[PDB]
Structures are given as C-alpha cells and as structure tokens.
Amino acid sequence: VRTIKVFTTVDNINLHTQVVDMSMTYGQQFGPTYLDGADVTKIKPHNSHEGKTFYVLPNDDTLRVEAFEYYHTTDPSFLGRYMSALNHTKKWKYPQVNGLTSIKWADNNSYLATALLTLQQIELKFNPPALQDAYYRARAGEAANFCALILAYCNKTVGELGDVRETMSYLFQHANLDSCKRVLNVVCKTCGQQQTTLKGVEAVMYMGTLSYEQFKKGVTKYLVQQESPFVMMSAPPAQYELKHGTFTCASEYTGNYQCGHYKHITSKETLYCIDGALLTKSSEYKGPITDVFYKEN
Ligand SMILES: CO/N=C(/c1ccc2cc(OC)ccc2c1)[C@@H]1CCCN(C2CCCC2)C1
C-alpha cells in the first residue's frame, strides 16, 4: 500500500501526524480537508503533499477542544468559512504603505483594507488566540490569515459589501476592553446629580458626531469623561475637514452610483490618504468622512 505522511490540524498550533493511503481521497480518510484554504476533500494525495499541514473539521473531542481554545467559538461552520475566505485572501496583495500593511483592491475589500489599517494604529488585546496571533502576523506584513479570520468572525464572505464601523465593533467584542469606561453626567440646574457609566466595548464607540472636541464639550446636555486607549466616532458621511494632529486616523466613504468605496486617512507628520495600494499625501484633507479614531496618550 502506497502512503505518505501528512499533518492534520484545526489551529496550526497542534499538529497531528497522519498516514494517508494515496489510493483514497482525503475526504474518505479525514472528512472535509483543506490545504491552505483549498478544499481537497475529493482529491487523492499527491507525492508533493508529503509533510504538509492540512486543516480538518473537528470531529472528535481532542480537535473540538483545540478549536474552541484557539478560536473561542462553537459555530461548526466557522472553520469551513475561515478556509473559504483564506483561499481568496491568500491571493490578495498586501503592500506596505507608510510602514503600514494595506490590501490591493480586490473583491470589494476597501472596507477590510481600511479596517486593517486602523487596527494597526490602535492597541487591542484580542481574547481568541487565533486573532491575536494573526494580528501580529498582519502587523508584520502577512495579513492573509487575519483578513480571512475577520471575514469569518463577522459572518461575511469574500466579495460581500462591508462597513468599517460594523467590522471594528464586532472585532472589539472579541477583545479585552474591561478597563474602558465612559462616565456620562446630565447637565441641568434642576435635575441635580445624574450619572451613568458605560464600561467595556460601549465606551470605545460613539455614533452621531465625528469630533472629539465637540463630544467632550457637550452631548439633553451631557458632560463626558472618557477613559479608554482609543475611541471610534462615527456619523453619516458628510464633507468634513481633517486637520493634521487633531486625530489618529479616519475612514472616508464615497457612494458614487450607489457603489461604495472606502479610503483611509492617517495623521503622521502629514496627512496620508491610503486607498489600498494607492497613496496620496496632503497637508489638508476635505472629504466625506464617516469614522474618526482618536487615541489616548
Ligand atoms: C451612505 O452611507 N451612510 C452610512 C452611515 C449612515 C448613517 C450613520 C449614522 C451614524 O450615527 C448616527 C454613524 C454612521 C453612519 C453611517 C455608512 C457609511 C459607511 C459605509 N456604509 C455602508 C453600508 C453597507 C456597506 C458600507 C454606510
């Protein structure tokens, strides 16, 4: 009997040595099987597959535990959806722009590129090891896996239209933000002392205005005390002037012909508009901004 040695895994951390009969398909021996995102279930082993690592679906307690510990989800479809996305994201190009990893436009990924750029400029501790590992690989230039995971965790497929604010929110909900806090106080002369506190993910997000200067000053009138490493402000896309040094980064959204497109503006020594692979540098920027991110120092 002709056989080769392969490795199976669900996390690419614990590798399980397996002997495969080249006469049988991977699906008959392991079940649904993947190589770098490609479904090889109906494929028989090639000699080139010797010593390669293959993803399989967790069909036993050992693989289930390893999967849950690594991904922090029980969704049985997660790994399949992750692999399906990876087979595309691995083919995307990831150019370095101004020291930041970006994505060349493909499969309507402007929102992912903009999120990827933003994530590199804020300090975030993910709870799932899968995200934390891919996060640091993405910051180093290898972001194909991180992008595939974002798609999987957000229940979005390659090519699906997406929203940066949504994507950031759902990723924040897989992060440790327990120390973040936003204390709100009612501004009144007759109501006395009225305060409520938002803790966790709610404290790092706000919808309604883009300016932190205004948000801090007011809103009935509410005084705000913000204690978070970062804050994301979102508002309907409208013409908005981005002044250098007054923000960290921002998302621009254009809706020409109801076909959306995102660009990323970051504030470095000057303003940089990163549109996928494209880069435009300006001292001033006016555009239809919809998200602005601010960092604590
Ligand atoms: C015309 O786009 N309007 C948008 C929008 C509308 C109301 C908002 C109200 C807000 O606070 C009250 C805060 C943000 C808001 C944003 C987003 C802009 C970004 C792109 N999205 C698209 C929707 C599907 C794909 C992406 C749509």
Numbering used by the authors: 2 to 220, 231 to 308
Excerpt from the paper describing this PDB structure:
The replacement of the central ketone group with an oxime led to WEHI-P2, with a submicromolar IC50 and with micromolar cellular activity in a FRET assay and was further elaborated to introduce a cyclohexanol group to generate WEHI-P3. Moreover, co-crystals with WEHI-P2 in the same space group failed to explain the significantly improved IC50 achieved through oxime incorporation; the oxime group, installed to engage the BL2 groove, did not form protein contacts and was poorly defined by electron density.
In addition to Mpro, coronaviruses encode an essential papain-like protease (PLpro) within non-structural protein 3 (nsp-3). In this study, we describe a novel chemical scaffold that targets the essential coronavirus protease PLpro, with low nanomolar activity against SARS-CoV-2 PLpro and other pathogenic coronaviruses. Our structures collectively reveal how WEHI-P series compounds achieve their high potency through exploiting an unexpected PLpro binding site, expanding PLpro drug discovery to a new chemical scaffold.
